[PDB]
Request: fold
Amino acid sequence: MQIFVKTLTGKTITLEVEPSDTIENVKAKIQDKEGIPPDQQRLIFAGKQLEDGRTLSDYNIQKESTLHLVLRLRGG
Amino acid sequence: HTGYVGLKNQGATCYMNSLLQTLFFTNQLRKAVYMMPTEGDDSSKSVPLALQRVFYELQHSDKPVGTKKLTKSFGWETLDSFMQHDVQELCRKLLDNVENKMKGTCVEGTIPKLFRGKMVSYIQCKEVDYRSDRREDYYDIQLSIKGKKNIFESFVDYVAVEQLDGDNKYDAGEHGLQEAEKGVKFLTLPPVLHLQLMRFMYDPQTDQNIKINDRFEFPEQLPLDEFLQKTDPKDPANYILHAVLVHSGDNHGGHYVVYLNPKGDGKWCKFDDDVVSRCTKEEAIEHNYGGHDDDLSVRHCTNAYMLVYIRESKLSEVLQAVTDHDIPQQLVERLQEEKRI
Reply:
């Protein structure tokens, strides 16, 4: 299924995922396409932060859902 | 002298005190927090109880309020914890924690009622007659700052259409992959609007993480009706500035304070950990726009990174009085007993 990821630049990329994909799997696919390592990714869907160990199915994510990527930056 | 009490600075906790005051003065949230059924909570491991305790002391203590039991309930007991998260993440996780605790209570759904809006992502193919919409909830809005004069220009940018092409063509069903355009439209805006200003970011150029200290203007009164797909004649999306969360510093680190006018009446105070003082509107608003005028003479690096607005039609409810009658006696008795010390 094709979802969207709104990236750090505000631009949107497409991502091909499976409902059984773990959030870890999704972060890895984002690195494959955008180059951001998984430990620098925070993914927000419908205002909620996606957690490792869960799957896309745990979150009602579907074709054309948008995940918001925010970078983990050190500070404060 | 303000009648509002500060929070102690008993270890580097960065943005935390700023956020705690911001949420404490979201009176309807504070009231719901007091109603959470924490009778049986662990007195140390419970984030809901720890927030009840901090709020109770902010409302009743005349001395600066400690937060060690709150950070223990978080499991964020060193600066590294705060270095590895940001205020948006702290806010979202805190609100999600107390939202879950409110499920199955007289106050279930308070967090979405206060903070949740609805938007729609719409896709239109460029060369085939195919379009699709997706509605999604949101609880805050991330606003691009770089190159934008003000909040208005950031909202225009937020809803600007983007092309989907190249390696990002849209899956248009029977039409296969298609060039398309994609945009966001707002369906609703919530009673309490959290705007995250994107001052801290990765910069591919210098290939590092930076803070943008550029000038970015935000108004006392913010009209957003023009960004809605459909407006409500009896409830315009007119927003009133409530809180300005401020950072002074650079790429190395800095100091965090928050400005609030708690009652929504334009009477502002500055909250700097244990020191709460009255300030002017200009000191809370214009002075936190940032900018670089006469940077040759001195660093200008003090500016807002998060704003809270409250919808005008909702102000008297969001900022309703919170009285001791609102606070369940079970909570009062448990906290008074804790000072067994």
